[PDB]
Amino acid sequence: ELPEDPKWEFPRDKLTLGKPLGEGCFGQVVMAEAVGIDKDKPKEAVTVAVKMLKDDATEKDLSDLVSEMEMMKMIGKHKNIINLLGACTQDGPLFVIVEFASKGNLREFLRARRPPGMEEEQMTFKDLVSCTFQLARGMEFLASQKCIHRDLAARNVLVTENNVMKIADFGLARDINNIDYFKKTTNGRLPVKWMAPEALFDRVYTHQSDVWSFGVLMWEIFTLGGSPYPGIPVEELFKLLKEGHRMDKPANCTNELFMMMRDCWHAVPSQRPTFKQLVEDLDRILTLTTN
Amino acid sequence: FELPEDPKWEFPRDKLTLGKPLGEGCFGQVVMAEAVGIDKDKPKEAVTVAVKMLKDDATEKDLSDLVSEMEMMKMIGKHKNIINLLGACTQDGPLFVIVEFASKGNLREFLRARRPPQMTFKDLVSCTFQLARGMEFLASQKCIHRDLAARNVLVTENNVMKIADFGLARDINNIDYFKKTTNGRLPVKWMAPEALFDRVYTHQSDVWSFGVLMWEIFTLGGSPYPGIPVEELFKLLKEGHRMDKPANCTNELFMMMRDCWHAVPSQRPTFKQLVEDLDRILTLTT
Numbered sequence: 269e270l271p272e273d274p275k276w277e278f279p280r281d282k283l284t285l286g287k288p289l290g291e292g293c294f295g296q297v298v299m300a301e302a303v304g305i306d307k308d309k310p311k312e313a314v315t316v317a318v319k320m321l322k323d324d325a326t327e328k329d330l331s332d333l334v335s336e337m338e339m340m341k342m343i344g345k346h347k348n349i350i351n352l353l354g355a356c357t358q359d360g361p362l363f364v365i366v367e368f369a370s371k372g373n374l375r376e377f378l379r380a381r382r383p384p385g386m387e388e389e390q391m392t393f394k395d396l397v398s399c400t401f402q403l404a405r406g407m408e409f410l411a412s413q414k415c416i417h418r419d420l421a422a423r424n425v426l427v428t429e430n431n432v433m434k435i436a437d438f439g440l441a442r443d444i445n446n447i448d449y450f451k452k453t454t455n456g457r458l459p460v461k462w463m464a465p466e467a468l469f470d471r472v473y474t475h476q477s478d479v480w481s482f483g484v485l486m487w488e489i490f491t492l493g494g495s496p497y498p499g500i501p502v503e504e505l506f507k508l509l510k511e512g513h514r515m516d517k518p519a520n521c522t523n524e525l526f527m528m529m530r531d532c533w534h535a536v537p538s539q540r541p542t543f544k545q546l547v548e549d550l551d552r553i554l555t556l557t558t559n
Numbered sequence: 560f561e562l563p564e565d566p567k568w569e570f571p572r573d574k575l576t577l578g579k580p581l582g583e584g585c586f587g588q589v590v591m592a593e594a595v596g597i598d599k600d601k602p603k604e605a606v607t608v609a610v611k612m613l614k615d616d617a618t619e620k621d622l623s624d625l626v627s628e629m630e631m632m633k634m635i636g637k638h639k640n641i642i643n644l645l646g647a648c649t650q651d652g653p654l655f656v657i658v659e660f661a662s663k664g665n666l667r668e669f670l671r672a673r674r675p676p677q678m679t680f681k682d683l684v685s686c687t688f689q690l691a692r693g694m695e696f697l698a699s700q701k702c703i704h705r706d707l708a709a710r711n712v713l714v715t716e717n718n719v720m721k722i723a724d725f726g727l728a729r730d731i732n733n734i735d736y737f738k739k740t741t742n743g744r745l746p747v748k749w750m751a752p753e754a755l756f757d758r759v760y761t762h763q764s765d766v767w768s769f770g771v772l773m774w775e776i777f778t779l780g781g782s783p784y785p786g787i788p789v790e791e792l793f794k795l796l797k798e799g800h801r802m803d804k805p806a807n808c809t810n811e812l813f814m815m816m817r818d819c820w821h822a823v824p825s826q827r828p829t830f831k832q833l834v835e836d837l838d839r840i841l842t843l844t845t
């Protein structure tokens with residue numbers, strides 16, 4: 269029932285499962301040591317992350333984990349994407365082997381480095397811009413691979429030992445050319461506070477709906493891991509989005525970067541910047557920083 | 560989005576004092592609260608309650624499921640072995656679904672906490688009987704739970720077993736829902752073969768789940784199909800694989816589990832038959 273793909277298959281006896289990285293809703297992720305995984309360096313144990321099902325897994329949990337594996341095969345290598353390293357798909361549970369990011373998700377990373385008195389090492393304004401630029405490059409790459417993430421948010425970004433930002437969690441990602449999928453998708457399982465109005469109301473997913481999400485990701489970054497639409501329950505966001513409600517400027521944010529967020533949140537999707545435009549604009553801001 | 564007001568279930572927000580979170584869920588949050596007017600007979604009286612609500616990262620489906628859960632609980636009458644709806648805050652704010660507090664939490668953790676390195680055989684039979692009575696009542700209210708398991712049973716300060724988590728429960732008369740259900744969101748290890756392969760949900764699919772619940776109880780919160788990943792259960796169920804007898808279990812109670820797991824749904828006992836058979840075992844025990 270699981271697909272065979274010999275070029276991605278990693279032998280189970282070379283994989284040593286270690287500490288769980290969090291107890292998980294639709295699966296479990298565990299630290300592991302993989303010995304041959306780097307073909308250049310056989311006999312060398314690489315620390316990896318292994319996504320697998322839990323005991324109380326649903327049919328949909330297995331579907332989603334297979335889809336996530338296949339979506340990662342279809343997406344090329346990029347510096348700012350969590351890349352597939354391998355899979356165990358035969359004579360046992362499904363293991364999807366991905367790059368370990370030692371510093372965890374970006375939400376927790378930002379929150380851990382907050383200055384005191386909002387209610388370890390601090391991030392500079394330049395660091396937050398570097399972060400945003402890196403993620404813009406990741407999404408420009410994804411858009412070019414015909415991939416809509418649909419679940420872009422700080423909690424779905426991972427940070428490596430070298431502070432490289434990596435887009436992760438491709439379980440909800442779809443090919444923009446998947447007509448049949450988009451024609452029948454009923455009730456959304458995308459966090460409402462990160463959804464483009466057209467995605468929320470009309471079930472329209474494009475790279476431009478990902479750009480809206482990127483704007484919320486920017487807001488998350490410049491609030492040092494704040495929660496969007498603070499004090500507004502999801503229940504009331506529906507009505508507020510239709511009336512053109514938008515978030516206000518974070519503390520760690522210039523008017524320039526806040527106007528970019530506002531552009532990301534244009535009512536008309538084609539009037540939002542492309543990721544390509546976001547990479548160029550952010551590059552210019554990063555080089556003009558003047559610490 | 561906006562909910563209609565059902566005046567008989569509406570509770571005013573200013574009478575509800577949210578307290579300690581009882582654990583962050585996957586599709587929502589449950590919090591302890593004090594509700595003062597909640598019992599209409601006793602207006603002055605502060606009742607400790609549980610409040611189900613959305614999280615900040617809530618999906619459209621999370622809101623749907625919380626509304627459905629509230630509506631399903633309205634249809635179900637009061638019963639000692641069911642978590643009952645007490646009220647809802649549905650207007651000018653986030654949806655609060657107010658339910659009976661069970662101080663000792665879910666049955667899985669309760670049993671695991673009392674494992675030898677506290678429960679008698681009679682206690683485990685009492686547990687099973689109580690839950691059989693709960694499900695007999697639900698079946699009679701035209702409710703299919705679909706997600707019967709130890710983690711969806713709550714234990715009160717007085718060790719009363721209460722069936723909980725009606726989020727996935729459906730009315731047998733909900734044909735529109737059953738006609739279009741795509742990929743299941745029900746834990747595979749508790750699903751009747753007909754529910755898993757054919758998307759057929761009946762009281763008899765709940766009876767299969769009850770059998771797994773029995774196995775969970777008599778293993779003191781064990782994990783079903785031990786060492787068998789969900790991935791390989793699909794094939795094993797088609798070949799008629801069934802779990803073996805727990806240590807703390809009589810041949811009688813194990814044969815009842817096996818009956819609950821009959822291949823043919825109509826050949827599985829009804830909850831009514833399970834209540835009568837378990838009553839007899841409870842009175843003949845000790």
Ligand SMILES: Nc1ncnc2c1ncn2[C@@H]1O[C@H](COP(=O)(O)OP(=O)(O)CP(=O)(O)O)[C@@H](O)[C@H]1O
Pocket residue numbers: 289290291292293294295296297317350366367368369370372373423426436437
């Ligand atoms: N490749 C990887 N390297 C390091 N940490 C990773 C990782 N992939 C995931 N993680 C982290 O492991 C933890 C797993 O927690 P959990 O299993 O509850 O997932 P989650 O909280 O992200 C819910 P979901 O992924 O279903 O949206 C998270 O902190 C996640 O960011």
Ligand SMILES: Nc1ncnc2c1ncn2[C@@H]1O[C@H](COP(=O)(O)OP(=O)(O)CP(=O)(O)O)[C@@H](O)[C@H]1O
Pocket residue numbers: 581582583584585586587588589609642658659660661662664665710713723724
């Ligand atoms: N009415 C109630 N009284 C007391 N405890 C309750 C309760 N309803 C839920 N709980 C407990 O609160 C905790 C929060 O978990 P929650 O109810 O969100 O489910 P869960 O964490 O098992 C995953 P799921 O969302 O799928 O149920 C659990 O320990 C649960 O058993």
Ligand SMILES: [Mg+2]
Pocket residue numbers: 423424437
């Ligand atoms: Mg995530």
Ligand SMILES: [Mg+2]
Pocket residue numbers: 710711724
């Ligand atoms: Mg539960």
